[PDB]
Design an enzyme around this catalytic site. Sequence first.
Site, mmCIF file in Angstrom:
data_model
loop_
_atom_site.group_PDB
_atom_site.id
_atom_site.type_symbol
_atom_site.label_atom_id
_atom_site.label_comp_id
_atom_site.label_asym_id
_atom_site.label_seq_id
_atom_site.Cartn_x
_atom_site.Cartn_y
_atom_site.Cartn_z
ATOM 1 C CD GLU A 1 -12.202 -73.143 24.406
ATOM 2 O OE1 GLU A 1 -11.461 -72.013 24.210
ATOM 3 O OE2 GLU A 1 -13.616 -73.592 23.936
ATOM 4 C CD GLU B 1 -8.451 -72.532 21.989
ATOM 5 O OE1 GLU B 1 -8.739 -71.677 21.126
ATOM 6 O OE2 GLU B 1 -8.498 -73.814 22.532
#
Lengths: 448, 448
Positions: free
Chosen positions: A183, A353
């Site tokens: 991320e 995720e």
Amino acid sequence: MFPQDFLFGVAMSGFQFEMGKENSKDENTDWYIWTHDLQNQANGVVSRDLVEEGADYWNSYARVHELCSRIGMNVIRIGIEWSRIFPNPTHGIKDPSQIADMKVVEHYKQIIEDAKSRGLKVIVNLNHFTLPLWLHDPIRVSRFNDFSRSGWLDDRSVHEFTKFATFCAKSFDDVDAFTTMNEPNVVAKLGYFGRLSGFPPSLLNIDLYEKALDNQILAHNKAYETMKQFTNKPVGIIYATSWCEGDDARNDAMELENWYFLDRVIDRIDFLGVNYYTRAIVKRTPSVLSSSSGRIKINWSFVPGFGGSCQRNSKSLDGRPSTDNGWEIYPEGLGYVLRSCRDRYKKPLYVTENGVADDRDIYRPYSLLAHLKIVEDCLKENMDLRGYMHWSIIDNFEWPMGYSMRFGLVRVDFKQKLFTPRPSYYLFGQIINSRTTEPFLNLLKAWE
Amino acid sequence: MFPQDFLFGVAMSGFQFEMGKENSKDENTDWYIWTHDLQNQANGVVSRDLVEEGADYWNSYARVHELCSRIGMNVIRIGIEWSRIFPNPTHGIKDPSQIADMKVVEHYKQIIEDAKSRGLKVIVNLNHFTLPLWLHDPIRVSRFNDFSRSGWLDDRSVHEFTKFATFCAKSFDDVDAFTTMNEPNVVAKLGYFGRLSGFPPSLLNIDLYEKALDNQILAHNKAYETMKQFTNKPVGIIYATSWCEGDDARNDAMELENWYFLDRVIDRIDFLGVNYYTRAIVKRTPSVLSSSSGRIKINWSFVPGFGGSCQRNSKSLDGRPSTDNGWEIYPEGLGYVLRSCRDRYKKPLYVTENGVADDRDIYRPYSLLAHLKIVEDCLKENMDLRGYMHWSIIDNFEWPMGYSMRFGLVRVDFKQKLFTPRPSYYLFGQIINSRTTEPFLNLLKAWE
């Protein structure tokens, strides 16, 4: 039925999991000094919890890996800490292998081999938010306007990350796959344009947001090119994909949240890891905010009461449950994001995720099943989707929230160093065993 | 650990589970005609759900038994319907075995033998609220003041129940134990002194409450004596044990709720089945209400906001969670009830019912574990506690609420005739396999 090659597993990072006994203490990151700063704590910017009193994955990895293999998962993604591998700056050292901490490298190789011996494929992620303190001191940046160690703003960061990546591709010969970073868009947006989020260095400057995005794009591209020279294993990236709904401003929001970065790294990844938790509702703003370069443009706002902006343990304004951290359960968004990635890019996809903050386990059974049903829908559409990895196997240190936000399939008593599976852990095992959500779907009716 | 011969299992009734297919339809009970009465439905006294569209245990018993045995349960308690075994009145017939429905008797023996063949001990309970229509028509009683078939008010009911009990003891020679009846105190109180509860015939007359209690006492004591002539298996009773807290009127409330009845049957049971769901809070009233006989005296009221009188899906005034039907989770009360039975009586104990109304499974994991921890505490005190049966394995017809209150470890989709275990089902299996709650206790900290 899920293909039997499909990967079911969990995701972890180094900083949020490793620490907990004195032999693993790593004081050498931006995040360590950020969370120990008393002024940050007094302002509620970070919690008072100690990362060094955490889950002790550094020594207890075999217990954690056994929790995964016991319910039949076949993949785990772990983070390795740049700050442990290279405790001292590498600038000006062409080949830094002689200043790597080989005790640390040997330890990570022992963790990798242990997971592999239990039937878990191992994805090793090179960077997960934290940076070596010699590269980023966020208190000097934040409080003293001192940019001598400025992280992804720093003119050494791209080069020093490439060197780190080269070393990892050479040394970690027995992983199943790598990802360069986790991320990066969150690091940039929350660090430099998310003042209420509590991420370091908590600046508020669209131009620095743009700079940190672009240095991470450069770092990823160069890292992929060097690592592919020294490893045959797939090298990808993990990205926090938003799903924006609302008026016509959705498209501009999605461009800055997702496609700007992903367009600029897609040619240099072997697979894309998608991290998805909830949706976001946007609406057009009366004015346009532009960076000084004119390259970044913001003309939307996020509407409260939906997605990440709900009340805790409540409902969104659409009547959907919100979790311990106020994030709306919106499983359809995972399918929308994945279909957008499939339409835009010709690239294998993984869900790297997905999870919920939920100590009592009153949201996780429903959320897990509903999101896996969406994943199964995508497989029925013949999408090249190769795995699903939940966040996470165990409760852990949730960045500025500390231990208060519990994401594990397994509860951790951090003081007693005790692992106790929640019922959602046993449900995940049953879904994995059946290789389909079809025998479980009726449970979803209790929530409509 | 729980002793090796400790029984873990579930409890069921005939009326709430059996029907669902045309071949099992039984219109011959007071409860069938009570729930089909359109005026009751228009008044909200009973729901519009059809018991004859239920879970189909009559034909699907193997599937239900396998749900139990696959988790390692080793006991099940099932109800036999008097109204099926003796579809026609037995009055004036010495030895009614010639008018028993032997196809029904053979079918129950098949159900019993199937459970036994999967490793479940079988407790057969002879009466569970419903009565044959030839014995009780509650619409004639309630709407037309016609007491010719008045149920437990009928002097006749005691003698015919004795005959039914005799026939069952002779006929069902492969059961492991019998109980005569299930919560007779609830039949009497809600039928004749619980006008808002929706139970038939919904009279409001303390003298008929008293009479229904006394006749069920007579029926139990007589049934026990006759049954023990023909079987060596244990014969007990199952009782809805209240746990009353509050001011000093709690002792008077406990006397009427529990000991009035139990004192008069204790010398005629081989074991006591304790049914426990929640507590009750009482406060002294200014006036004393006396029955005409003087044998029943009421000088307390029940305090709203606790125990059975909470708002649905909320919290009690003590901050404890309340379930889909507004019942407070109060697991300590199970230990208090069992210890008071231990102190008052010298009698082996079973928990024969405990559970929650909870479609989403957000309360049952917590409630199951917390109550089993209390049971384990009682075992450490060396109390003669021999088993725990959860209410129930599957969702079923919850008397005047119909299907809206779902008590199962396993969800039922009644239209599709589909069984889907909830996560609490898998947790129960793990606790049974461990033979102790100790490895699971940390889950309770999430609820404080």
